[PDB]
Amino acid sequence: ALKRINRELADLGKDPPSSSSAGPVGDDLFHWQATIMGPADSPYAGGVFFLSIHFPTDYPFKPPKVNFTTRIYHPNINSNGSICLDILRDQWSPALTISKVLLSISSLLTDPNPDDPLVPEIAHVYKTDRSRYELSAREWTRKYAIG
Amino acid sequence: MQIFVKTLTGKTITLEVESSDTIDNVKSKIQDKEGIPPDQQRLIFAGKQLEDGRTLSDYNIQKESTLHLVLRLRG
Amino acid sequence: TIDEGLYSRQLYVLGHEAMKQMSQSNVLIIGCKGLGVEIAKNVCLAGVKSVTLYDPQPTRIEDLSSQYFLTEDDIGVPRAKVTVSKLAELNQYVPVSVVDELSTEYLKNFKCVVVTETSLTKQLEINDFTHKNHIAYIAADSRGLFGSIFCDFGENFICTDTDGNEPLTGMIASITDDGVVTMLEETRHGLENGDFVKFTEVKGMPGLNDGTPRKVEVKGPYTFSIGSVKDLGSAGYNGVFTQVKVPTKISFKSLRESLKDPEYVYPDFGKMMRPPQYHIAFQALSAFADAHEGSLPRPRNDIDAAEFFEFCKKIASTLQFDVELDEKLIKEISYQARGDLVAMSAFLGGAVAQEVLKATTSKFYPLKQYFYFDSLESLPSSVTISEETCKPRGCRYDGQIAVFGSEFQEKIASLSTFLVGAGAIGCEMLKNWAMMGVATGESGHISVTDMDSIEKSNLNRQFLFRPRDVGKLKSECASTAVSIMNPSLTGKITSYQERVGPESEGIFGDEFFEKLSLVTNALDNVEARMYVDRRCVFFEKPLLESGTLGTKGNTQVVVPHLTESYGSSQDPPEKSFPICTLKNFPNRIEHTIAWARDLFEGLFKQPIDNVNMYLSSPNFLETSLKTSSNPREVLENIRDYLVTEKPLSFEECIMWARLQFDKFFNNNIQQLLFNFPKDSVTSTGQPFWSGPKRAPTPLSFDIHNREHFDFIVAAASLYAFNYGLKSETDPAIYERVLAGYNPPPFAPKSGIANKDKQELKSIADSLPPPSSLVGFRLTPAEFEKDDDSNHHIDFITAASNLRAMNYDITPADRFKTKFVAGKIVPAMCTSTAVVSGLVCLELVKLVDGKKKIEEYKNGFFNLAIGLFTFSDPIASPKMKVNGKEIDKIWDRYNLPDCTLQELIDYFQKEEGLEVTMLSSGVSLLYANFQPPKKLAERLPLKISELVEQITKKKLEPFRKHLVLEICCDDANGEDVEVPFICIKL
Lengths: 147, 75, 985
Ligand SMILES: Nc1ncnc2c1ncn2[C@@H]1O[C@H](COP(=O)(O)OP(=O)(O)OP(=O)(O)O)[C@@H](O)[C@H]1O
Ligand SMILES: [Mg+2]
Ligand SMILES: [Mg+2]
What we know:
With 147 residues, chain A is of the alpha+beta class. Helices cover 33% and strands 16% of the residues of chain A. Chain A is globular.
């Protein structure tokens, strides 16, 4: 348990994130608070987003609870910060690591999936008026992801 | 040789391949033609799903064979 | 009229039809020894129409070796007469009678006939009549460590369900004209060749939607074939396939014909040559008994063994069996011919009861036909077993001494066990220990701990509890019952009411755990299992794990320094549906039930908790503003539930329920359809509402509909309970109030600075001050499935059915809603009996102190298909540490309470390893990447002081040790695992 946890915490430093910083919150390994940098080729460029990761007591036999903290205007993320993914929900094989989650969220930010959305209105805006979606994403990532 | 790949909507794509070609190369060609990521391509022939790491000859694919391409759905 | 308040757990295994047909079947039981009484108990708990007993032999003392309804005051009285009185109190719906004499024609009064402890000639006479009149006949026999079961349900038995599983259903991606059916992506149907399925809602091939079952040809894990569909159509898109289960005809043979040419059922493939031996052995045993006036061979007698072997040879020659008899095995059977164990009796009784249920309900696949079982590996090897030691002493333990001897009996009498839980498995374990005389010696002791209380639904499988005991603690009732059963256990049992967890370590401390001999788990959750496993590993005590699920069961044994712990094993996880599916696009009834549960939690539990916490914490708002994910939601809930929508009568509750109905079943659907119209297409051009996504449709409120009215009533009642008002159920008031309701207009919205904090502050200050409201508390609704007078399951069913009607899904009744929402685990009495028998057979192995790993057997079984399997336990993995052999699980480092620096130096100098991470509990005491200032501040402190400082909590006085997890790297930096550290305070 804490074995796994620490092994991954350690290899993280040996695996220069480049776009993350998963740091335990104080001295409770069961509650990390990582970070994600906005992709350059995305409307969310130049933004810092904080995420809270709560490891279940049965980790890695149960998926970690990853919730966004910085408000983000994305089709597949709701205001509560819940993340729409399968590696976190049902596809959580006991053969995964924080690295993967933290480059799969970056890939999601790279390109949303509006065909199976979590926020129907934002998905509709994205599908119909791309420019308005771009403007809204830039405004949100400037209001929240900056400062 | 030449083969035909049928999509879920009845479309037929003609591809020029060789019996020794790997599944990965065929998925690459299908991504080049339709833009579907290989990870989401599920190719089936004669009731058997083609798996990465093998060749067409492994599945006894011959002249003018017909495959079916279904697409995985993201979460 | 099935009493679902009593058979709640059983109906999830059998069903309504099975019990309806079962409540019309009569069972006759010949023989009332331990096996017979166990079968009778299980059948009575099952719920058959009635049970009749026939065993006129006078009671003897040795019969109490496996009988728990007999006392030493019953010597000389017929067993049936003294057993019926205690059997009649188990269930009030099952009358129990006794018949002095048995006549052949009388057998026509029963639907199933179980025969035990009867001579072979009488068995043949009964079978010759019960075969030609189509009566189920089950014959059971238990001799020491051997057991035989024979089943005969006639020559035209009809088995409706052959596996007990739910029909397989799935979705279709594409169907070719050649009958090639394809599943969705990474979807496995699980079908087998020869199965029948039917397709519905298939687009492009309506002909396949007729419903005619079709054959299945498995072509791959994801695809199969049905043949040729040239006439029906060209290509099919989407659809759902469902398997159809057809009844099968199974034909048995009479006993007389099957004696010559039997049909064995092999319970284990490692020993396949034994059943042919046992088949001869039991017939020879019956012949020897007939040749000695029904006197079985004396225990460990050589002459009787020789005579029995001669009889075996004669029978083998007579029957033209071309098998060479194994002398050692046959003579061992002869030695234990008079043995009578309670574990084997319970095991066989559970099995036979399940067979009776199969015979009566015509369900599941039965045994076909013979079943010979042995647990000869349980024979002790650390004690002297001879004729002198195994002779009876005229005591109630003769049936067990005759197998194990007096010395092993004394070993058992001095056990010091610890049983966790007092459920069904706990009750069976306690019964077995009481019968065996466990901890009846001077140094023996039993401890039983469980905090739950007895409920009505527990009486179906827990025979130690009576309806007059509803509402009391389980441990006290169990202790009293087992003291009544065995008076020798008066004062040798201690019953606690403490939950086994981190908070009970003040009682289950070092003193408590240092006197035990073994720990037996009877739990139903994985977390507590892991906790007990960790404790056993720390103290190095044998552990006995047992689990059941419907008709399936498994038993595992953990032995110190020999086998791996439970934690190494893992059960399959739980599939949590993606939030997108539940929130927006459901396609099954389980999604709707989960959505209803979440809605209930968000409407009746969380807001009340927020309101109560606001009036208690003086600084709640400030903490929530910077801690909670959605402070705005909390503020809105508090305002709405305090001032904006505080009801003053039940009519306002009805109005609020109507408004919530409109909000959740009429408005959100309109919004969703406004965002995604029914004719919308995806990016690839495919229709959006196709396949797993079903186009919804808003609902209009119609009071005359039953479901709408049920939802309104449930919501109003729950709201009134929350606000402590007086609820009503008369429809007149509802119809009067709901007539005068004006639906507010609603139109979907298309959308198109730092004042948010100002708005939140404005909302916050609107709330009345906490000082203004003193003593005003709202009652949160805590979900309770077992109570039928709180409208919880009613509300969940109403919400799930309404949401299903929204998306054209098949609605489910209250029964399945309660099954799914409440996470109810199906349970059976037969499975409990079998697991108890297996665990008690492993217990005698543990007592004997067997050292080899091939002599233990983890067991698995599935009673739906009569499957039994036993495998050797997995050996604990070894490793190389500092060029030495280290056990991964059962090894630790024992150190004093030295400073952290001294511990690091010890690990550097002794093991030659560099410590990189050191943790304890849920805290990271030391790490290699921490700032040097922190380490320099923490290095010169002792481990106990460091833990006290980091955890911000003083170590309790009862604490005497610390468990530290250490991850260290070698000289080259390569990570190497090391065993944990046991710091001694
Ligand atoms: N951590 C624990 N400490 C002590 N006893 C426990 C613990 N976890 C579970 N138990 C006990 O395990 C038993 C579980 O058995 P069982 O599931 O048959 O009973 P139940 O939960 O009352 O019934 P049902 O599951 O049918 O609703 C209960 O007595 C429960 O008290
Ligand atoms: Mg309970
Ligand atoms: Mg339970």
